[PDB]
Amino acid sequence: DEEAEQKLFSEKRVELLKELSRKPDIYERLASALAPSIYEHEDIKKGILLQLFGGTRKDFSHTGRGKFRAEINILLCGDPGTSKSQLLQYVYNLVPRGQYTSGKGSSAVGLTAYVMKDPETRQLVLQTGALVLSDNGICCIDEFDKMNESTRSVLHEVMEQQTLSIAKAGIICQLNARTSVLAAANPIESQWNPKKTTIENIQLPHTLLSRFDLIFLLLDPQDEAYDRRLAHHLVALYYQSLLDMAVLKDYIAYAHSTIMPRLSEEASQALIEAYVDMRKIGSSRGMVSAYPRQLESLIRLAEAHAKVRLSNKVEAIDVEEAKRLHREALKQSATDPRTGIVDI
């Protein structure tokens, strides 16, 4: 509602935002402002920032095609203790219109809608669930793997059609659910074992995986130096004693209100080439396969990156960053045709 109303920013504030947009490291600087007390998950924070900006909302009514999913979906899969839940909790406590779910505490009707009695008018009233409450926001699903398949089947329609067609006795209707999904899962056997492929080790249906347009593998490199650095960060966090949030908030609201990035010609060609190369790279045995849904993924991420720069026009740097982020998540460089992830 605030982004809707036109006098949210003074002119000098708009100039301040625009001057911020012109810095070379605005993407880095905005991503780093997220979760300031989480130590160097820079790419994850970039992806979450892109989720906050979102892709471009397009009207596909005349194409007779069905609504396009402009929201960005992220899976954080990694071995335990790697700060996934802290990121989901940070996002949950940051956005308006969010919901947080963990494990088996949610049922399918509890995620979509059900009928209760109004204990003040004794009328049966339909009441929404967690995925409709976070309609124009973000749903953070924690312990995504530890979630029974009856209630994850619900996520297919939400994550593709952005709608939720309940066909029950009382009323049948399509509830709109334009939520962005931020999920955290453990691998099969709740620890990456490096003798299994990515697919064998994530253990999620290829359809469900294709619905996520970033999969960050939060693997733990058995690394002395990184352990030392994170140890110092965590201990310093016990004796504690940037980019302001009041400008990050305004920057994001401005980007939502004014910027609607459109694909340019070089972006279009780069997207085509990126999709073809992505299919060749992921067509291997145990790697995460690419589908046309991943080309739509790339379009979304590129539009989000162009929204970060207040670009209002997607060109080749945005597509390059989308492809780079899609590679870095999933550790495409550290896999191989004999699928399996190396220690860097």
Ligand X SMILES: Nc1ncnc2c1ncn2[C@@H]1O[C@H](COP(=O)(O)OP(=O)(O)OP(=O)(O)O)[C@@H](O)[C@H]1O
Partner DNA sequence: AAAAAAAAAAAAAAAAAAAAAAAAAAAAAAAAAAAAAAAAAAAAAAAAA
Binding site for DNA (CB under 7 A): 116-117, 119, 122-124, 148-149
- Helical H segments across 117-264, by residue range: 130-133, 149-152, 154-161, 198-202, 206-210, 224-236, 245-258
Q: According to CB under 6 A, which one of 56, 83, 134, 311 is a site residue for ligand X? A: 83
- Note whether 151 binds ligand X by CB under 6 A: no
Nearer to ligand X, 22 or 238 (CB): 238
CB 285 to Mg ion: min, Å: 30
Residues with Cβ within 8 Å of residue 59, at least 6 apart in sequence: none
Nearer to DNA, 116 or 234 (CB): 116
What does the DSSP assignment read for 197-232?
A: -HHHHH---HHHHHT-S-EEEE-----HHHHHHHHH
Number of residue whose CB is nearest ligand X = 80
Question: Is the CB of residue 142 less than 8 Å from the CB of residue 103?
Answer: yes
- Note whether 81 binds ligand X by CB under 6 A: yes
Binding marks (x or -) toward ligand X, 200..239, rule CB under 6 A? ------------------------------x---x-----
Question: Is the CB of residue 56 less than 8 Å from the CB of residue 262?
Answer: yes
- Give the DSSP H or E segment for 153: none
What whole-number distance in Å separates Cα of residue 111 and Cα of residue 102?
A: 12
Q: According to CB under 6 A, which one of 21, 56, 82, 294 is a site residue for ligand X? A: 82
Q: Is 22 annotated as a binding residue?
A: no
- Note whether 106 binds ligand X by CB under 6 A: no
Residue reference for tokens 């709109």: 176
Q: Segment near ligand X (CB under 6 A), from 34-42, 47-55, 120-128, 286-294?
A: 34-42
- Note whether 46 binds ligand X by CB under 6 A: no
* Residue 326, φ and ψ in degrees, nearest 5: -65, -30
Q: Is 296 annotated as a binding residue?
A: yes
Q: Is 186 annotated as a binding residue?
A: yes
Q: Is 211 annotated as a binding residue?
A: yes
Phi/psi-derived region of residue 262, left when phi > 0, alpha when psi is between -120 and 50, beta in every other case: beta
Which residues sit in the known binding site for ATP? 39, 65, 84-85, 186, 211, 293, 296
Chain residues binding ligand X by CB under 6 A are: 38-39, 41, 80-86, 184, 186, 230, 234
